[PDB]
Symmetry: C4
Subunit: 387 residues, 4 copies
Amino acid sequence: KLGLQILKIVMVTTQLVRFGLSNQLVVAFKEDNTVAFKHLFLKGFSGVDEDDYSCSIYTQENTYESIFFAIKQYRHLKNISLATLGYGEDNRTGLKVCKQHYKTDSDIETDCIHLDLQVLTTEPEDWAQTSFFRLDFYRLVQVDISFALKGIDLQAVHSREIPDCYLFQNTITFDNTAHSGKIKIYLNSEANIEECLLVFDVFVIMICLASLILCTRSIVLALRLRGWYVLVTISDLMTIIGSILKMEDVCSILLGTSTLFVWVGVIRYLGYFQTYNVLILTMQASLPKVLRFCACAGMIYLGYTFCGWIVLGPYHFENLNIVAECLFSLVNGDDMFATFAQIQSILVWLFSRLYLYSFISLFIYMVLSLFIALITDSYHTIKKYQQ
Amino acid sequence: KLGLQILKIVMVTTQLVRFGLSNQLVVAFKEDNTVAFKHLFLKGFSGVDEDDYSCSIYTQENTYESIFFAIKQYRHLKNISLATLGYGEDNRTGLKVCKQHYKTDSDIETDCIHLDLQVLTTEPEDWAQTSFFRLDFYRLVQVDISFALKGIDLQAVHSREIPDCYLFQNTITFDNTAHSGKIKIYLNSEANIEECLLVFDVFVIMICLASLILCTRSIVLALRLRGWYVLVTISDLMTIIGSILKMEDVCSILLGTSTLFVWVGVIRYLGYFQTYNVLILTMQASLPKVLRFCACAGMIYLGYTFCGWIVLGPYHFENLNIVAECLFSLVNGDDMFATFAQIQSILVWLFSRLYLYSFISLFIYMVLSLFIALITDSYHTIKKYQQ
Amino acid sequence: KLGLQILKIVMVTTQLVRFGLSNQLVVAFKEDNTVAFKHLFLKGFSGVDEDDYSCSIYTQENTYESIFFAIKQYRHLKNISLATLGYGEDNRTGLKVCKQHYKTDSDIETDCIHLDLQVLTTEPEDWAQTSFFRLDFYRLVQVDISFALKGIDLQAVHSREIPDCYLFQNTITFDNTAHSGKIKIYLNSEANIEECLLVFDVFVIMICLASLILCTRSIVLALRLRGWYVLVTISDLMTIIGSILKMEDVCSILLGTSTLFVWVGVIRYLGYFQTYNVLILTMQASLPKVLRFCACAGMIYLGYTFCGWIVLGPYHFENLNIVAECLFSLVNGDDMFATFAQIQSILVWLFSRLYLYSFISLFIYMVLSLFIALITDSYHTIKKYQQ
Amino acid sequence: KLGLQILKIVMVTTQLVRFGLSNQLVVAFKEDNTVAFKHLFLKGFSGVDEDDYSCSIYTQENTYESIFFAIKQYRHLKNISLATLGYGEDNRTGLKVCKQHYKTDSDIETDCIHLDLQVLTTEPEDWAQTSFFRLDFYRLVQVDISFALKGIDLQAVHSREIPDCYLFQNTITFDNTAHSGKIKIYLNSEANIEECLLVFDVFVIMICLASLILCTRSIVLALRLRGWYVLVTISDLMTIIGSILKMEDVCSILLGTSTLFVWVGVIRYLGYFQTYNVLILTMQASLPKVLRFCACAGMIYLGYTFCGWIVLGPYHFENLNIVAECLFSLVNGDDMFATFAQIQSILVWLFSRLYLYSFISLFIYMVLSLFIALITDSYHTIKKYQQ
């Protein structure tokens, strides 16, 4: 089981490199088109990829300029853009502007008016003078602009075989829900194909099935006689199910974890040399005390995250995941001075100061030193075991 | 006291999550309106949230453009803004421009002229040519523009019950006190409501009172027989007083510290397993030597902060809190290269260099290694105690 | 062999300082001219040195403006620039615009039209209305603008001797290969000279040859009797071959590694004091166990890099090298919060979260503490050896 | 010597806080005026405080616009600025434009034409068409604009006593020495006063003289009987000489180091408690082995800095101080990913990668772990000494 397992290492590594490079190319085309949509249909989109909202409006005239800008850029799409884009399909072409507003109270009704491309390319501003583009900013909820663009890929034609098509369904929104003098703008784009070797994969399937059967022979041998082979069977299952989902993302996660446990199994096969045996036994003998200490430090960590979220929430810290990520950065060095910079509030400032000093001092000293003291004890006991 | 205490954990955690999310929403509305005031009333406010001053003027024409801009945006507030804003109340509407200047010497007198909206709403601009808007930049101290805006929240009406109102009291200032060719601009905004379940909280009060009485029964039992229960009583007091201030911020700090000690008490109840007992006894036995070493390192740290403040103050470092935060970042790795970048001054440069090298080398090596050597000694003595 | 070896230290250090300062000056001139080409020939080049592409176009009108801008700036080069630049040589002056496009399919033919400077300096801009500057953005591959500029250096004339000349061969490209609505712009510049003491280096050659012969006498003495002298002979070879390539970059790498091993040999000659002997024996006795543990941690590290590349590739991570660099930063603390910021995708987000926490916790704790436990064991065994 | 020494602590701390705050205010006025000069006299100075050069010109028209801009802003200084500035004194008012250029070769002659303010305030701009403002960018070396501005401080009049004046001597330069198509712009400003309690300091002098005499009594007592008192006498000398230079910066460095050793002496007086005695004896017993190991690691560090400077110099790294600061950041975690980002060059790229990995791995592991192993050994030997 030397060549059959090294062949697993090499074949699953090649499968993951080819598959990851394929999805790299495809998602590069996806985000290239959505950035090249944000530069066309959003007014004043600077190129600084700002946030999940691409920009935000603070006045009641840039709203009209952005709406009329999106409609005029959609009308002159053929001149303006420089991809291979063209109008698609409500089973019709042209825009569809839905706006939402309160009933003069409680109900959010919507008024959605469709705009065909013959209405736009007649070219008097007749749609621009209708009452539908009169907006009551006292009671506007949102304005959504939606349309459908098809785009041929030609990087596939570049140095490879011909056929590929796409279809984009864009939705430009004007999110005014926190009625607080700020409209955010989104561009939610989709993409899905239409018209206009499995040998390596089944090969990896056969390799992982044979390794699974032979490792279960080893498992039942160890059962009748009486866990790295558990991880080898796990890697078998993850590669086979990842190959099923690759055949008919989740499959990316399956192949990624499978190759991670593949290289951990290589770290097992380094253990024939006895120095790697010393290191592996150090990790195996020290792991549960580390898990218990990580659990206790995690409970103290939760106490600090709830305290920092319900105090320094307004002064930084919005979600608990953001607070947990920032405090895990603060323990590990980075983002340290930025937290002291974002805090000005006199008593709350003093609380923030001794909070951060107590947190950093306590966790770094009495947690990193304790994790060193666990591993040093385990390593010297294993040195005494080999003496 | 298992269910009564785990009910405290979960119940005070739910109280803090609900209360923190409520204040998150309210302060999100507050800062959304003050950013949407800075974008309306400050000329050339780029959206880069620059400092506590939002921008700064370096000439004597952008001053006039910013003042006249603030007045004209206040006049066209109904067209310009896109919240639900409206003019409020000097018991009157309209602006109130107070400017301060030296007596041709010693006295800073002020000249404050009020501007009603009927004066602005005249078709000719006649306020712009009074002598009050002639400024002597030899002797101008500050110019303050103040007004009052009311704004209905409608995110409360969004998917919840209706009633909410506000009243903002803005104060645009032109701070020229360091008479040094630089006017800073502020927008100091306020907010306070006007017109146009306590079951969970009293439930937490009852839980914490019952736990307080029963833990005092445990305290007097330990007294008559002869400190985690001290922290449990502390958590009782902090949740009860936080519930009082929530009933009739400080209450945020009370609830945050209370939940922090709540999860520390959970870390106590992890101690029934003996590995957590080993870790907790390691921390308890090693804490006072760590405190004495932190005190001595803090005195050396104060020596370095006073030296770096009175030397590298001009070349970076303004307040002692800023110097202490930057040096606490420098010990923990972050902001390391930025301090070497901000320093050019030949002998003072050499002093800065060996200052930073001596500081980082001395504290990181002979303090982090000493904190490891304390904890390793304590952990091996406790291992010998359990052997 | 005291003076002959310290003379090697100081002499090769002086050689490297002089040679590195010479190449510093020359490459400073090179990048100064290529930045001053990007500011002249690229439209809207902000001065923010953006990427290997200097800027990118997202519309089909800034393409025409950038092409016509590059041609007009080349025509007015004598007025526009402020170096000593002049037109050079296709064996002719003037531009040469080659554009590439698909055959209406499969073939990428090219159409390359040359533009002499007398054609540019006509009173009408009649080249701007030829059909060659009609572009089909459905099928355009790239547009390349190329020309040749000569430029005299005068910093050489500044405070030194006279003669120096250059010749630049610029190539402005409009890279539209990912046919995805985005043209990137490059400026690929070249430089090569034309017309218009070796005593120190041969001295280093003689020093290193004498030290090489005498250290081989020491080697054959140790052979007939039965490895720092190996590193001294290595430093001899690297300085001699670096002096050969300096006589007739690679020579930069040779001299850099040679001086690195020069100062490592100085660290050897610190070993006459016995404290440095303790430290050097600690490193020598602890090195192979460190190498085996680094190998095992490197295999686990490869598992994490393949997993993070094939999962968090779309959400960050393009090449495997970039993933390895970012994870080596994450272990050492830097770029910690930036990885949590660039991730939003719900299940993939959860996977990213426990991926990063498991990675940081496992490697920092059970690798840094294990490396400390190796060195502490080796140092105490060497302390027992000296007791 | 308890009260006499604690009085030294408190009085020298108050002296340093008052003196540092005084110089903070004065240098705040200095840099406020030089930023408010860069915003007036430099064209397009964005407010991004870019470098020691405030901006840089890449064309031959922004040169003329910046020169003519500086002259016109100097002419309209009274309208443009908003400090209390006024024209000062060549013993005359007005500008003095010196330009330097090559002799058609070798000699850099200069042509310096003075401009009185009456020449500027003529009804035509007849100075703008003299031949002196014709520039040969083939052979221009630099253009320098110089003038003298006086400015009254009024922050001194704000809430304090009256008298203060200043005089600024600005020098706007157009540095074209690397004749490489890039003019840098400087604004070198000066400042010096003209016309228009020592009780605390002599008190600290008396305290430090009395402590110096009494500590020399302790020194001669220890001499006749047979070093913290050495540091106390050092602090005496540094405070006295700093008070001399404060009476009649260097004095900032003297007072900063004196207060640093003051708080180190406080760390000595913490040693009456025996835990601080343990920590202080740990540092004192472990210091020389740490110094020898720091020396050996510094020699290896010099090897890496010379190698990285003569290789990665062109691809990052200009001065050896910059390389040493960046590598000291790389050891301490910070600036880690930025060094991998700034490197693209295939073999040199591979050299950069294994350079950085070998550097970080070798120094962090086999230096930080060795520094921990020194301190742990010293601390356990001192624990055995107290057992």
